[PDB]
A paper describes a structure:
The members of this enzyme class have a TGXXX(AG)XG NAD+-binding motif and a YXXXK active-site motif and form dimers or tetramers. Some BDHs have a high twofold stereoselectivity in the conversion of chiral monoterpenoids by preferring one of the two substrate enantiomers and forming a stereocenter by asymmetric reduction of the diastereotopic keto group. Here, we report the determination of the structures of two stereoselective dehydrogenases, SrBDH1 and SoBDH2, by single-particle cryoEM.
Size-exclusion chromatography coupled to multi-angle light scattering (SEC-MALS) revealed two distinct species corresponding to an octameric and a tetrameric assembly. From the 1 551 724 particle images that were initially picked, 173 781 particle images were selected by iterative 2D and 3D classification cycles for homogeneous 3D refinement. After the application of global and local CTF refinement, particle-based local motion correction and NU refinement within the cryoSPARC framework, a final gold-standard resolution of 2.04 Å was obtained. The protomers adopt a Rossmann-like fold as required for binding of the NAD+ cofactor. Loss of the cofactor could not be prevented by adding a threefold molar excess of NAD+ to SoBDH2 before size-exclusion chromatography. The quality of the density allowed the modeling of 50 double conformations of amino-acid side chains and the localization of 268 water molecules.
Author numbering:
A (entry chain B): 13 to 204, 220 to 282
B (entry chain D): 12 to 204, 219 to 282
C (entry chain C): 13 to 202, 219 to 282
D (entry chain A): 13 to 204, 219 to 282
Write the structure that this text describes.
């Protein structure tokens, strides 16, 4: 059986660390060619040194809040590997916790929407510039459980994660007529006072007995990137173990 | 007979000079409320100001909802006129030009829509909260649209912002529930605010509910409901006024020819 | 200002007690003529004696699990008051708590779907028989928060409440072409009396107010009136934000 | 790289034909052992002769509307292959089209809920009897787009598909504490005079153009939720509708 992504070209924004690093590593294992677009042009190569000088991985410096940067990333990728088949919008931030809305600064608010929403739309816009004439492609954005439910995070974070789902569904509507799939992946809180946050998210988890790892989220992306999701679009794939579809506040099934 | 449904309540309406906001203001006033309009362009702001008359239970404050200090002055003005703030209506909203190809969507156009639709709504929540939290009572209502739940019903920036408003509504409802404050949003179907007849026929043909046309007063009635004590335990709700448009899909012609 | 439901005829299934009793009382305050369809004539009229022997309220005995019973209710209401404008499907049960699915009896399962789903569909079907030629009407079903989220109740209950939402949306699709509105109302939970009262309030999103039966009734009155003349396919939550939020991570609640 | 389901035991209700046949064939390609539970034991083995002879596939006659039948299916599978790791509830019917609710017979209504809802719950109940002491497993039900949107099918069908989603979420809540994943897969209409014309019709109203929804596409979704790549996926309605339910092209914003 061939590798699930053999020959496909992928661009991953924020791939230098965190979930993006997992996605990049998993994509390579399944035969993909991957370009990382991330800030701090030193660190993206610094990660690239760790994984080696493979001729199927490349780094482009890109601030996803600048349209011309993301443009240069896509133009760079198609010049290395000849096309662009997968676009992963992983750049995302949360903002500081704010327990009282009366202390929520609009500057903090503005920054989160600039990165979480504007950055994702720019990625869709320039991936579309390649994928539409090819009549094929797969666009994947990393949302979180805050895309479907309130109270799971700060206001600007929750609003932006909802906005990403709305963009996903609307752009899925426009790009469906060209064969382009748009989807988003919404994870539960992932660890990495360490075992204290690790215990907390596990105690409030619906699914007990396994910990949500970064590789779990990556596996969801790999699915939506491959031809096994060939007819999947406009979908918010939850990797929350059932956290959002349930509520154990009345203690019907949990003590 | 029975008392008026909003008697003695103070309301602030952003964008009340025209359109749906004008209906909300007029309906609120019919049910006994005191209303302050916050709207831009004092030329249009005075335009309605004279239009309604000179009553001592209506007032106008000039406010660009994209400026936090403007909305701050609106709230501070209202509580100085009528003594408190019980209802906050975020009706300022824009759609943007139609754009059929994402490859031609300008980020400046994108930025403007989110500034007004999302940032303006959050600022309204933030400063209404500054009054309503110490009173331990209030009702915040935002005017979304059917684009808050379904894709393809409008441009990208519009659909994203309407989704963002629903997300803010639910999240702020989570924070303000502790204090007895209700946060909800109202999502209308397209309203026809010779080409008028042509758009009017188009939205009616694609409507789920036939034999009636969505008027501005219909949307206002939904707000009046969520503003009153008949919605005393309603919060976090996206009250659709779409006649079933979003909950159904007649593309397979099971029930429509 | 006139009463919000003046001259309107309403049928309420399960209106002898609980939420249905409040819906009936509220409907009458707003000028409606109301027919109650409920079991146990010995009690169905006995409560109808406490309200009084008015000429704008009537009782018909009806097992909502029997199609011919619901049929006679609608035929009775129309013969009393001349038409049928509002149909309220309030008959609903939950079943015993079952903490382990391996002990869930299928007979218990069958009974809940018979009353909660089959009873609601029969109500829609025979209300439709009147409302379609009139080209007007409003059908309202009483769901609960279990219509949108799992874990808030037993399996058969949660499944049936989801089924009611699905029927509501699908029948809204068919009856929209005739001007008929279909909606559903999903309430939050309303010495064990007092200790249940504190428990639902502690886990409530909206604090400082308790969900009363009159609150749910007000939602129905809204969807029954012309103030909702363009509302259809809607699941109106009266849960104070309970289903749209989750305080398990203690972001906003301690 | 090993096969994605190597050593896992799966029970598939309705596996003789349609989507279930593809799920069985795909599961087998990825190393799984499969038991088919389907009515009409005549045809039920006829497929088991169609696919071929194998010591990793088996057939049990089972009416999913009878609890004791499904019970015997699970007890049969565990005795053949030693455990039960995957349970697929594919048995499902739709009922005749009914354009006017005033002509909808309650007998027709009763039959659809008996098979679509009661059959699915029985499958969950008896899969749970095995999977809870093992502290592992994956339960997958085949819903359709009618689980999320009205108007896409008859009333009894749409109600039952909604009920299945509700059961999925609620049972996911109870079985999460044991490590058991419950999910459902909701496909768009699959084609396989009125063949090429129903096929041309669902494609015109599809959001995603240039690709036809095949049965193998739906099977791939199940394989995903059956494997350890969905190890933390539960309570999920995985749409395979190409974006059909998340969009609405009635206003012709993006489609002419």
């Amino acid at each position: 059986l061939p590798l699930r992504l053999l020959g496909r070209v992928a661009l991953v924004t924020g791939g230098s660390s965190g979930i993006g690093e997992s996605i990049v590593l998993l994509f390579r294992k399944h035969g993909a060619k991957v370009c990382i677009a991330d800030v701090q042009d030193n660190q993206g190569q610094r990660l690239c040194e760790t994984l080696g000088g493979s001729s199927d991985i490349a780094f482009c410096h890109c601030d996803v809040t600048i349209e011309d940067d993301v443009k240069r990333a896509v133009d760079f990728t198609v010049d290395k590997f000849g096309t662009l088949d997968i676009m992963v919008n992983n750049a995302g931030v949360s903002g500081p916790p704010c327990p009282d809305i009366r202390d929520f600064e609009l500057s903090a608010f503005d920054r989160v929407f600039d990165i979480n929403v504007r950055g994702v739309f720019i990625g869709m816009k320039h991936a579309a510039r390649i994928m539409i004439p090819a009549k094929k492609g797969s666009i994947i954005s990393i949302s979180s459980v805050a895309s479907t439910m309130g109270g799971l995070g700060p206001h600007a974070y929750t609003g932006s994660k909802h906005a990403v789902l709305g963009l996903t569904k609307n752009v899925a509507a426009e790009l469906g007529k060209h064969g382009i799939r748009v989807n988003c992946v919404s994870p539960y809180a992932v660890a990495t006072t360490w075992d204290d946050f690790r215990r907390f998210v596990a105690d409030n988890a619906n699914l007990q007995g396994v910990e949500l790892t970064m590789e779990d989220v990556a596996n969801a992306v790999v699915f939506l990137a491959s031809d096994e999701a060939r007819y999947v679009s406009g979908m918010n794939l939850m990797v929350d173990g059932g956290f959002t579809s349930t509520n154990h506040a009345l203690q019907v099934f949990r003590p």
